Each structure stands twice: as C-alpha cells, then as structure tokens.
C-alpha cells in the first residue's frame, strides 16, 4: 500500500478549478461564473451585486421586491427582468 | 473553526509528494522414482482419491518427479466429483 | 444407383478442391444422415475455432444445409444441436456453375495474350492502351510518349504468355473430364 | 507396498518388450519374489499371460501391417477413432507407412512438423486429388454463389 497512489489531489483540484474556471458548476447549470466588468467602479459594484434567475410572469416586477430588488436597474433584451440587482 | 497551518509550506509540501520516506506504517502490506511411487501408494492406502496439488503439498519434494510418478501408476480423472484427481 | 454417384461426385470435388478435414466432415455426414455438432467435435478432436471455418466453407459452397434441432431432455436444458445434412441438388448445381465459371474465366485469359495491344510506363506506373498510345504520338518523336511523363512507353503483353493459358485449358479439361462426366451421368435422371 | 512392485513389474516387462520366463522375470526384479504379483499379472488382460512356459504378450493394438491398419480403419466407420500413440507404440514409425499408403489407404492431418504430428485414423476412397492445380483451386474459391433462388434461375437460363 502507498498513501501517494490512494489519495489523489487532481480530483479536488480539477473539480474546483474546472467548476470555478468554466461557466458550468458540474448541463444543469451554466452562466454562473462571469468575467468581472472593469469598465468603471459602478459597473463593478452593480456587477458583483447582480443576481440571476434561471429560465405567473417572472419578468414583471412583483410587490414583494420592495427594498430587496432595485425596481429600475435591469437589463433590456432577452434577459429583461430575469436579471436582478440587490 | 478550521486550523491554519502556519509553517514554511515547503515542509508540508515536501511531505505531500515524494519525500524519500516509505513504509513506517503497517497497513494493507500482505529423487528416486521407486520411493516416490511407494509413498504414493501409501497415500493411496490412506485414501484413493487425492488431487495432484494436494499430493504436491503432502509429499514435499520436486514436483516434476512427482508428476512423472503420477503419470505411470495413477489415472487422472478430469471430470465428475473427483475431478483433477489421480486414482 | 444415382444417389451414390452424387456421393462420389462430392468426394471428388471436396477432395479435389479442398483439404483433408473438409472430406473428413463430408464423410462424417455421409455416414450419418443427421450429424450433431458435438459428435463432429468429439470425432475429429478439433476445437470450435477449427470446426467453424470448415462448416462455414461447406455452407458457403451450398454443399450442405444445417438443421438446428431443439432439445429439452433431462436437465430441462434447451440443448440445440446443429445437425448437418447433404444438399445434393444445390451442391451439384454449385459444381456445374463453378466448372462453367472456371472454363469461362480460363478462356478469357487466352484471348488477351493472343495479340499484344496495350503498353506500359515504368516511370509513373500507369498503364496505357493502344488508343492512348496513338493519341500521344508526336511528330518530332518516333515513339509513343506518356502524358504523365512525356517519355516513351514499353510494349505490354507478349506471345510467350499465350503458351501458359493453353496449358491451363488442357490441364483443366484433363482434370475436369471425370467430374463433368459424372455431372452428365447424374443429370440424366435429374436427381 | 506390493502394488508398486506389480506396476513396476509390468513397466519392466514392457521395457523388455519380449516374452521371458516367469522365473527369469523374478530374477531380473531381484527383490520382487512374490507370487501375488504373478497372480495379479494373470488377472491383468493388458499384458496377456500364456500358460505355456513364460510368455508375456502386449496388446494397445496388434496392428503392425498396412492390411491390419485397413481393417482397424474399417472397424471405425460410423463410430469414433483412436489416436497416434497406440499405433506408434504397437509399430515403430507409422508415419512412413502413412506416406507410403497413397490415396486414402491411410489418411492423417499434418498440423505441425515439430510436435510429432497429432495424427488421425480414417479411411475413404481417393482423397488424394492433388493433381488439381492450385490455380484451379484459386479460381474455385473466387466464385461467389448467388444466394436464395437466384442460383436455380441462373442455371435454368443456361440450360442445366
Ligand atoms: Zn509515365
């Protein structure tokens, strides 16, 4: 028996490095990890606090979003209302 | 909480991979033909049916001579309940 | 009888165009009308991978047909046994058609060596016929060139090879005369 | 044990290979002066014992001539077959007679020319037919038969 051949480190290293490296978290989940937007300071502040919702109408603003989700800061296009900001 | 090892890293990293230190812990370590013929007939007197490997484990001697002594006076049964046995 | 002449025909063809084990299996079926697979294996003491290609060869020539017979005896085991049976008419038809194909294929090779026509090119290893040869003839040259190499060609075929195709016809007829005579003897009764 | 003296006596008389006197057999074995070995030898049909003087005959097969070989072949039609050991032990060098017995007078199967050739003992009629040229055999294997009912139709169009 050998302790170097039983316990491998490339399973945890490749799993964490691969999951935090690619968009997938293992397709189940995709688009979790995104490159940080360094266009300005408010883009990084509004980028880190950005919350996503996977695909009643979920795009419309609900009354329970008072004080929790910004009623104005939301992108336009296909992902309108699915992306939210704290 | 989780304890952070504060050492110079190189010691622990040396203990990780190859460190020229193995073992240190026990875990999952795990002839005259006539006389041989007479002895074989004595074993036949004890019991007629015996496997060739068992005879090689009882007579305790070079096995080639024992095989040649079994191919002359005994017949090898390959099938049946006494399979792989000389009688 | 007529049935025995078919047996002698199969002995002459299988013995004359194949090895020994083929007539071993053949005679093993001529002795027992229904020959099991376990009987032929324990008979010739040959392996399964050695009994396979023999039966497959005797079936590819339409010599014998197989009959996978069921068995549910003692131990309730579905023991299947491939019983071989000689297919006389299909085997005779196979012999006649194969002889005809041998004669026709050995007659075509004699007409090619009777008169050389085409050429050959050593440089590009491409064959050229008389047509392309006379179509690649130039005025400043005295020999037929080659489009790939623009170099002269060498005359292909010769009359020396014509003596080989005739000996194959004569020897083939001398070795096929008893077979075709047995065929003409069997085809009288259509059995 | 006396059984080892019995089997040793039979192996010794097989090493001799010719009938000798019973007393001479007991003298060649030195210490084997038992009569129970002689009685067990009389009970053994493997080595036939002639009551006239001292004579020990050896069976597998009494075949040593090509005619006896042909008879032993005829005694295997629609049955099984023996091996090479019995014939080569009953008659030295049988493969020479096999090569001399041309055209199905003695058949075999040449496997390897390095392992004494595991033989075969069957009989037919001709079996030779090596006059068939190899070219005719190659032209016989290249013919692809039309399967199903295409072959009888292709033969009825030619007139056969
Ligand atoms: Zn060319």
From Swiss-Prot, chain A:
Q: Where in the cell?
A: Nucleus
State the superkingdom.
Eukaryota
Q: How does it assemble?
A: Component of the RNA polymerase II (Pol II) complex consisting of 12 subunits.
Q: Which family does it belong to?
A: Belongs to the RNA polymerase beta chain family.
**What other facts are recorded?**
The binding of ribonucleoside triphosphate to the RNA polymerase II transcribing complex probably involves a two-step mechanism. The initial binding seems to occur at the entry (E) site and involves a magnesium ion coordinated by three conserved aspartate residues of the two largest RNA Pol II subunits. Present with 18700 molecules/cell in log phase SD medium.
Q: What does this protein do?
A: DNA-dependent RNA polymerase catalyzes the transcription of DNA into RNA using the four ribonucleoside triphosphates as substrates. Second largest component of RNA polymerases II which synthesizes mRNA precursors and many functional non-coding RNAs. Proposed to contribute to the polymerase catalytic activity and forms the polymerase active center together with the largest subunit. Pol II is the central component of the basal RNA polymerase II transcription machinery.
Protein name stated in the entry: DNA-directed RNA polymerase II subunit RPB2
- What is the scientific name of the source organism? Saccharomyces cerevisiae (strain ATCC 204508 / S288c)
Could you say which residues of the full protein are shown? 442 to 539 of 1224
Swiss-Prot record, chain B:
Q: Where in the cell is it found?
A: Nucleus
S-S bridge residues? none
Family designation: Belongs to the TFIIF beta subunit family.
Quaternary state and interactors: TFIIF is composed of three different subunits: TFG1/RAP74, TFG2/RAP30 and TAF14.
Role summary:
TFIIF is a general transcription initiation factor that binds to RNA polymerase II. Its functions include the recruitment of RNA polymerase II to the promoter bound DNA-TBP-TFIIB complex, decreasing the affinity of RNA polymerase II for non-specific DNA, allowing for the subsequent recruitment of TFIIE and TFIIH, and facilitating RNA polymerase II elongation.
Task: Spell out the note in the miscellaneous section.
Answer: Present with 520 molecules/cell in log phase SD medium.
Q: What is this protein called?
A: Transcription initiation factor IIF subunit beta
Please spell out the taxonomic lineage of the organism that makes this protein.
Answer: Eukaryota, Fungi, Dikarya, Ascomycota, Saccharomycotina
* Gene name linked to the record: TFG2
From Swiss-Prot, chain C:
Q: Which residues form the HTH TFE/IIEalpha-type domain?
A: 6-96
Compartments annotated for it: namely:
Nucleus
- ZnF C4-type residues are 121-149
Instruction: Point out the signal peptide segment.
Output: none
Instruction: State the function annotated in the UniProt record.
Output: Recruits TFIIH to the initiation complex and stimulates the RNA polymerase II C-terminal domain kinase and DNA-dependent ATPase activities of TFIIH. Both TFIIH and TFIIE are required for promoter clearance by RNA polymerase.
Q: What's the subunit arrangement here?
A: TFIIE is a tetramer of two alpha (TFA1) and two beta (TFA2) subunits.
Quote additional remarks. Present with 35900 molecules/cell in log phase SD medium.
Family membership noted in the UniProt record:
Belongs to the TFIIE alpha subunit family.
Q: What is this protein called?
A: Transcription initiation factor IIE subunit alpha
Query: To which species is this protein native?
Result: Saccharomyces cerevisiae (strain ATCC 204508 / S288c) (Baker's yeast)
Task: Tell which residues of the whole protein are contained here.
Answer: 4 to 194 of 482
Curated annotation (Swiss-Prot), chain D:
Q: Which domain of life is it from?
A: Eukaryota
Residue spans binding DNA? 1-64
Locations listed in the record: Nucleus
Protein function: Recruits TFIIH to the initiation complex and stimulates the RNA polymerase II C-terminal domain kinase and DNA-dependent ATPase activities of TFIIH. Both TFIIH and TFIIE are required for promoter clearance by RNA polymerase.
Question: Subunit structure, briefly?
Answer: TFIIE is a tetramer of two alpha (TFA1) and two beta (TFA2) subunits.
Q: Miscellaneous notes for this chain?
A: Present with 1150 molecules/cell in log phase SD medium.
Q: Which family does it belong to?
A: Belongs to the TFIIE beta subunit family.
- Name it: Transcription initiation factor IIE subunit beta
Full-protein residues shown? 123 to 283 of 328
